[PDB]
Design an enzyme around this catalytic site. Structure first.
Site, PDB file in Angstrom:
ATOM      1  N   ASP A 482      38.741 115.318  16.750  1.00 14.53           N
ATOM      2  CA  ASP A 482      37.993 115.245  17.991  1.00 14.53           C
ATOM      3  C   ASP A 482      38.542 114.106  18.843  1.00 14.53           C
ATOM      4  OD1 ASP A 482      36.171 116.169  19.761  1.00 14.53           O
ATOM      5  OD2 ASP A 482      34.415 115.242  18.826  1.00 14.53           O
ATOM      6  N   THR A 484      36.537 112.401  21.819  1.00 21.91           N
ATOM      7  CA  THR A 484      35.497 111.435  22.151  1.00 21.91           C
ATOM      8  C   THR A 484      34.650 111.150  20.918  1.00 21.91           C
ATOM      9  OG1 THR A 484      35.401 112.000  24.499  1.00 21.91           O
ATOM     10  CG2 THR A 484      33.433 111.039  23.513  1.00 21.91           C
ATOM     11  N   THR A 835      27.386 116.541  17.710  1.00 25.32           N
ATOM     12  CA  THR A 835      26.761 117.804  17.342  1.00 25.32           C
ATOM     13  C   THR A 835      27.573 119.011  17.785  1.00 25.32           C
ATOM     14  OG1 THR A 835      25.441 118.436  19.271  1.00 25.32           O
ATOM     15  CG2 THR A 835      24.680 116.555  17.981  1.00 25.32           C
ATOM     16  N   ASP A 837      30.585 119.495  16.721  1.00 27.50           N
ATOM     17  CA  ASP A 837      31.544 119.725  15.654  1.00 27.50           C
ATOM     18  C   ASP A 837      30.912 120.146  14.336  1.00 27.50           C
ATOM     19  OD1 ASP A 837      33.371 118.923  17.531  1.00 27.50           O
ATOM     20  OD2 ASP A 837      33.847 117.008  16.584  1.00 27.50           O
TER      21      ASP A 837
HETATM   22  N1  LIG Z   1      25.497 113.185  28.659  1.00 29.05           N
HETATM   23  C1  LIG Z   1      26.158 114.137  29.321  1.00 29.05           C
HETATM   24  N2  LIG Z   1      25.652 114.578  30.495  1.00 29.05           N
HETATM   25  C2  LIG Z   1      26.310 115.530  31.163  1.00 29.05           C
HETATM   26  N3  LIG Z   1      27.447 116.148  30.835  1.00 29.05           N
HETATM   27  C3  LIG Z   1      27.924 115.693  29.670  1.00 29.05           C
HETATM   28  C4  LIG Z   1      27.359 114.715  28.869  1.00 29.05           C
HETATM   29  N4  LIG Z   1      28.131 114.502  27.737  1.00 29.05           N
HETATM   30  C5  LIG Z   1      29.128 115.341  27.879  1.00 29.05           C
HETATM   31  N5  LIG Z   1      29.068 116.091  29.023  1.00 29.05           N
HETATM   32  C6  LIG Z   1      30.017 117.107  29.463  1.00 29.05           C
HETATM   33  O1  LIG Z   1      30.122 118.091  28.452  1.00 29.05           O
HETATM   34  C7  LIG Z   1      31.498 118.489  28.335  1.00 29.05           C
HETATM   35  C8  LIG Z   1      31.740 119.097  26.978  1.00 29.05           C
HETATM   36  O2  LIG Z   1      30.647 118.757  26.110  1.00 29.05           O
HETATM   37  P1  LIG Z   1      30.916 117.877  24.832  1.00 29.05           P
HETATM   38  O3  LIG Z   1      31.867 118.624  23.982  1.00 29.05           O
HETATM   39  O4  LIG Z   1      29.618 117.462  24.133  1.00 29.05           O
HETATM   40  O5  LIG Z   1      31.572 116.560  25.419  1.00 29.05           O
HETATM   41  P2  LIG Z   1      32.599 115.777  24.557  1.00 29.05           P
HETATM   42  O6  LIG Z   1      31.843 114.834  23.578  1.00 29.05           O
HETATM   43  O7  LIG Z   1      33.490 114.967  25.440  1.00 29.05           O
HETATM   44  N6  LIG Z   1      33.515 116.874  23.691  1.00 29.05           N
HETATM   45  P3  LIG Z   1      34.295 116.080  22.424  1.00 29.05           P
HETATM   46  O8  LIG Z   1      35.430 115.272  22.962  1.00 29.05           O
HETATM   47  O9  LIG Z   1      34.837 117.159  21.407  1.00 29.05           O
HETATM   48  O10 LIG Z   1      33.277 115.135  21.681  1.00 29.05           O
HETATM   49  C9  LIG Z   1      32.270 117.212  28.630  1.00 29.05           C
HETATM   50  O11 LIG Z   1      33.589 117.500  29.077  1.00 29.05           O
HETATM   51  C10 LIG Z   1      31.429 116.566  29.736  1.00 29.05           C
HETATM   52  O12 LIG Z   1      31.870 116.978  31.024  1.00 29.05           O
HETATM   53 MG   LIG Z   2      32.205 113.788  19.876  1.00 24.03          MG
END
Ligand SMILES: Nc1ncnc2c1ncn2[C@@H]1O[C@H](COP(=O)(O)OP(=O)(O)NP(=O)(O)O)[C@@H](O)[C@H]1O
Ligand SMILES: [Mg+2]
Length: 1123
Positions: A482, A484, A835, A837
């Site tokens: 992953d 982030t 969550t 993954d």
């Molecule tokens: N708290 C939040 N509020 C709004 N949009 C969000 C938030 N967190 C994440 N996002 C958006 O959700 C998209 C995909 O969701 P998500 O996979 O949970 O983010 P992510 O953690 O960056 N993915 P990852 O790198 O695999 O952990 C991201 O590219 C953001 O644009």
């Molecule tokens: Mg993550």
């Protein structure tokens, strides 16, 4: 099976137990006992079949052995137990036993006992109930698990359990609410372990050596077997104790029973019981799964998911009671899951009085061992694939050793028959030769190596849930990551607000607005969206908790947070109060988060009084550009430029529902998600410089240079993922992104290969195969939209072979990526935090959850591996331990068998000539081999990974070839020494010292020491022999003892083991023979290790010559910088 309707049950048969006199290990042997009695006491049959009293003892031993084998077959085999103990009687109305055989690698089979009117049994601590309408046993069904989905009116007006007889019915039906794993004592666990087949085989070998008048040797090996089985029993008890520590201890909760609030412990909790949840204490989540009826709960699912972001569980009292319950839809945040820590209880129906403690009202849905954490614990303990289950490869290796045993024993039987020896003594010698080859520790060696790997991994705060994935870490081809939270730290810093002039300034050639204003100097609507669209909550102590991104933008905003979900700014660009009324939670599949609030905000420089209701939404910019009214000019180029630098960009949008005034109460505020996340304006771009972890680059360069492939699966943008993978050195060449050319509702119709600088644009039809020039000369990034368009086409198997960055993927798309990588034959590791993954963590061959926190319970069920620390260096270390595990197993599979083979042929070279081993000699040899085993057992690992890979299977050409070559060298030296001893003195019954016995004893001692010193795995995966000076000195001490009693320098040692004096020429010849044997064994093992031990890396992990040249240049530069 139709009898038990579960996916994990293969065979089910309704047995009925028989009396003990009708058992198949009792009745036919009782029938045939007077036949042997009439043979024995009544004459004329004494010489008819047996002929002697020693043959009578042989027949008595054989009959007793067959009786105890027929008894033990009912214990080490479930099907033989059902054949030999209980009659079938396949009818429901009279059955009392149920034979349950599960599916393969899903726990141990059993003969469960029927208990009953509700007919039920318990298999793997899971309760199965008989349904006569389905006419089958099945898993327990709750009120949630009903096929007609119940309405909320039965949950809002549940009022707890109202009947005492129904309470007793629920107690008898669903059982009590405990994690019922019984830890056994030493007595019953050793009683179970003494019935295992290799213990029985070792005791049979002890009796065989006792029959041949070997007192000290049999006593020594019985003591060693007893302490080894005690060690195994203590290891199993320790593992079950650490599994028992995962259970939630009972704590007093206030339930609503019989119309009254009653305090009671959490061990007594039934479904449908009204409960009150408060702030949980330390070392306790909540017991069982509940649904919130009245109140709001700030909870933390650090158990079910890896991340520690607190979610905001809402209530069901706002939802109408006639609505159908949707567990996967609107009421996903309605439920409360077991094992999860509730961080706060706030109140922001049924007519019941409130609880004495200020808590939220909930209804128990899934109690006991069938709750979600409990259902994962049942799979992780009783329904897992065990390490201690005997593999067919080890049993086939034991059969190969038995083939060699029969090859030696047939020749010694023919030579004893032709020379007319005593047939009972010859038979005992042949059985001793056969039984001295099977190593009883060999099927349990992988479990010992796995346990040592777990003890080594616990130093780095890495706890493994399912220990059968430890060898899988030794053969990982693809190491998915992953971005982030795994390769990126949680201390995000807000770069600011971008694109304020979009549609209303430094512009580039593509039109990208590069003006990045600060958060304090931002507009009023941007400030209100940043103050509105978050899931931030202040605890009762006074600490702000939530998403690190939301905490970072709160600290950049400069707004304090109140008590009743309000945020105020005191006299920073605007002044006013915002109060969030409804909050739509963030989902990874939706990639957005919206919130409805009430604002009173004034700009300090102009005025512009903004009052009333407000909708602030932040999310991925493609979704926001899909759901706003008029997309501004150069919208895509702005966020593509601010993502090209590696920063993480979100989009902020606003919508005024009522403008001046108010929306009006909570009756209108119960809107819909799709009816309010549309027709939006544009507020701006939230740009955050997410910082890289310090150990990410080192760990990924360690994995890439050690025959693993590192791919990146992340839900973020293609440009952020590409820039991070270029920093972390996953992508080396020029990269290409497979994505839609425009992310609007019309532009998302075709797939394009695009460059990062937006210069190359190649149209792609998804049905056609991918161009091989693009696959060969360019690295690839694939968007989850383009992956979804490649779902059932020919090129998909190309894509998963040639893509190392996956971007914008849903959690189900990550699951699809890992399932496809599993389907091509590549073993997969997935390192994840959030969550998004948890589906991917349960579908990889090994899954690690990186809990981002720096300084048995509190171990997450999201992944089989859980790293408590935040370092990325915990990811190679696991793999290193996994490799070492296989390596350790390999070395024991090269030592023990070879050791046994040497002993067997040594006995053969004795038993061809009628002389036997001395009791003191074989006891001293066994003690020295145990000393060398204890000396070689303690060995740690190297500080880095290697390009070589250990062989996972045990029947490879390296292990078999090395064993055959070393065995050929040993048998050649043994045959030559036997022929030389026959040449020196001719051959013409108690143990008497002779030249041949002394020579064979010294050769088997020095050959066992030589195969200990030669077959020890060294530099590419562990330390060498010389580095562990305790191990080296322990080997050299026995080497010096053997060479001192071979040189005849010490007569006391030679008379202690009853060794004859040697001729000087014979001594020189024998010392040269020992040196030649050790040198030939080392040469054969070194040649076969350099040729066939290196398991080749698969084609996905093979590196191009320029990457290898860069790695060699960097290694040479670091070696120069070390000096
Ligand atoms: N708290 C939040 N509020 C709004 N949009 C969000 C938030 N967190 C994440 N996002 C958006 O959700 C998209 C995909 O969701 P998500 O996979 O949970 O983010 P992510 O953690 O960056 N993915 P990852 O790198 O695999 O952990 C991201 O590219 C953001 O644009
Ligand atoms: Mg993550």
């Amino acid at each position: 099976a139709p009898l038990v309707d579960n996916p994990q049950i293969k065979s089910a048969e309704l047995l009925r137990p028989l009396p003990l006199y009708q058992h198949a290990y009792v009745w036919p042997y009782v029938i045939v006992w007077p036949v042997f009695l009439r043979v024995y006491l009544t004459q004329e049959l004494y010489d008819k079949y047996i002929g002697a009293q020693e043959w009578t003892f042989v027949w008595i031993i054989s009959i007793v052995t067959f009786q105890t084998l027929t008894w033990l077959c009912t214990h080490w085999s479930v099907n033989l137990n059902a054949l030999f103990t209980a009659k079938k009687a396949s009818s429901i109305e009279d059955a009392q036993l149920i034979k349950v055989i599960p599916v393969a690698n899903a726990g141990a089979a059993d003969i469960c006992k029927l208990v009953r009117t509700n007919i039920s049994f318990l298999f793997q601590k899971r309760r199965f109930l008989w349904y006569p309408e389905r006419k089958a046993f099945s898993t327990l069904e709750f009120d949630i698990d009903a096929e007609p989905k119940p309405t909320l009116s039965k949950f809002q007006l549940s009022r707890g359990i109202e009947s005492e007889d129904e309470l007793k019915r629920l107690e008898q039906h669903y059982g009590t609410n405990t994690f019922d794993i019984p830890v056994p004592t030493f007595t019953e666990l050793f009683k179970e372990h003494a019935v295992a087949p290799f213990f029985v085989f070792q005791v049979f070998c002890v009796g065989l050596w006792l029959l041949d008048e070997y007192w000290y040797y049999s006593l020594f090996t019985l003591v060693m077997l007893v302490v080894f089985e005690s060690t195994v029993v203590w290891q199993r008890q320790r593992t079950l104790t650490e599994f028992r520590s995962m259970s939630i201890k009972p704590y007093p909760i206030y339930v609503y029973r019989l119309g009254k609030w009653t305090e009671i412990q959490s061990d007594k909790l039934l479904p449908g019981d009204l409960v009150s949840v408060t702030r949980t204490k330390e070392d306790s989540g909540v017991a069982c799964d509940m649904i919130l009826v009245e109140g709001t709960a700030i909870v933390n699912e650090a158990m079910l998911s890896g991340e520690s972001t607190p979610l905001l569980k809402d209530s069901i009292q706002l939802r109408p009671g006639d609505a159908v319950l949707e567990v996967d839809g609107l009421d996903k945040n309605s439920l409360l899951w077991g094992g999860t820590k509730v961080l706060q209880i706030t109140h922001g129906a049924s007519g019941i009085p409130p609880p004495p403690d200020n808590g939220a009202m909930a209804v128990v849905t899934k109690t006991g061992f069938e709750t979600s954490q409990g259902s994962l614990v049942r799979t992780m303990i009783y329904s897992t694939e065990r390490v201690s289950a005997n593999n067919t490869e080890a049993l086939l290796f034991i059969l190969f050793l038995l083939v060699f045993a029969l090859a030696a024993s047939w020749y010694v039987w023919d030579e004893g028959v032709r020379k007319d020896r005593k047939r009972s003594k010859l038979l005992l010698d042949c059985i001793l030769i056969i039984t001295s080859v099977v190593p009883p520790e060999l099927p349990m060696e992988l479990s010992l190596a796995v346990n040592t790997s777990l003890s080594a991994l616990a130093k780095f705060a890495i706890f493994c849930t399912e220990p059968f994935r430890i060898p899988f870490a030794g053969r990982i081809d693809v190491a998915c990551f992953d971005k982030t939270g795994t390769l990126t730290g949680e201390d995000l810093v807000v770069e600011g607000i971008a694109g304020l002039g979009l549609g209303h300034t430094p512009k580039e050639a593509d039109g990208a607005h590069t003006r990045m204003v600060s958060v304090h100097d931002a507009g009023m609507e941007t400030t209100l969206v940043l103050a509105t669209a978050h899931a931030l909550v202040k605890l009762d102590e006074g600490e702000i908790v939530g998403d690190p991104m939301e905490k970072a933008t709160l600290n950049a905003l400069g707004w304090v947070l109140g008590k009743n979900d309000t945020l105020t700014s005191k006299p920073s660009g605007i002044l006013g109060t915002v109060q969030i009324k409804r909050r739509f939670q963030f989902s990874s599949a939706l990639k957005r988060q919206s919130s409805v609030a009430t604002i009173t905000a004034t700009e300090v420089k102009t005025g512009r009084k903004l009052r009333g209701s407000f909708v602030g939404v932040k999310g991925a910019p493609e979704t926001i550009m899909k759901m706003l009214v008029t997309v501004p000019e150069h919208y895509e180029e702005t966020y593509k430029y601010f993502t090209r630098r590696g920063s993480r960009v979100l989009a902020l949008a606003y919508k005024q529902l009522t403008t001046e005034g108010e929306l009006g109460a909570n009756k209108i505020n119960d809107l819909k998600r799709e009816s309010v996340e549309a027709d939006l304006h544009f507020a701006g771009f939230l740009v955050l410089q997410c910082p890289l972890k310090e150990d990410a680059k080192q760990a990924v360069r360690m994995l890439n240079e050690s025959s693993h492939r590192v791919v990146m699966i992340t839900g973020d943008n293609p440009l952020t993922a590409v820039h991070v993978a270029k920093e972390v050195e996953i992508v080396d060449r020029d990269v290409l992104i497979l994505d839609a050319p425009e992310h609007s509702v019309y532009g998302e119709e075709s797939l394009v290969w695009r460059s990062v600088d937006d210069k190359i644009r190649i149209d792609v039809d998804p049905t056609k195969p991918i161009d091989p020039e693009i696959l060969k000369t360019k690295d690839l990034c694939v968007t989850g939209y383009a992956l979804n368009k490649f779902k059932g086409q020919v090129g998909w198997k190309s894509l998963l072979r040639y893509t190392w960055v996956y971007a914008r993927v849903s959690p189900k798309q990550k699951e699809d990526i890992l399932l496809g990588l599993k389907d091509m034959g590549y073993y997969t590791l997935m390192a994840g935090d959030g969550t998004n993954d948890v589906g991917a963590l349960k579908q990889a061959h090994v899954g690690v959850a990186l809990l981002n926190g720096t300084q048995l319970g509190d171990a997450s069920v999201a992944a089989p591996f859980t790293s408590k620390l935040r370092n990325v260096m915990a990811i190679p270390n696991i793999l290193r331990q996994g490799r070492c595990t296989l390596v350790a197993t390999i070395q024991m599979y090269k030592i023990l068998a070879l050791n046994c083979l040497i002993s067997a042929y040594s006995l053969s070279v004795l038993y061809l000539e009628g002389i036997k081993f001395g009791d003191g000699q074989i006891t001293i040899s066994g003690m020295l081999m145990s000393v060398c085993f204890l000396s070689i057992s303690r060995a740690r690992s190297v500080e880095g990974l290697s390009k070589e890979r250990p062989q996972p299977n045990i029947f490879n050409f390296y292990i078999i070839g090395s064993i055959l070559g070393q065995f050929a060298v040993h048998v050649a030296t043994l045959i030559y020494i036997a022929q030389l001893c026959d040449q020196i003195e001719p051959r013409t019954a108690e143990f008497k010292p002779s030249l041949l016995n002394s020579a064979v004893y010294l050769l088997q001692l020095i050959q066992q020491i030589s195969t200990f010193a030669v077959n020890y795995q060294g530099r590419p995966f562990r330390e060498s022999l010389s580095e562990n000076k305790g191990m080296f000195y322990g080997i050299v001490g026995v080497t010096a003892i053997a060479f001192a009693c071979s040189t005849e320098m010490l007569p006391e040692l030679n008379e202690a083991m009853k060794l004859v004096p040697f001729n000087e020429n014979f001594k020189t010849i024998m010392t040269t023979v020992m040196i030649i044997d050790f040198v030939a064994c080392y040469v054969i093992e070194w040649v076969l290790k350099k040729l066939f031990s290196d398991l080749r890396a698969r084609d996905i992990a093979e590196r191009r010559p320029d990457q290898l040249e860069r790695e060699r240049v960097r290694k040479e530069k670091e070696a120069r910088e070390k000096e």
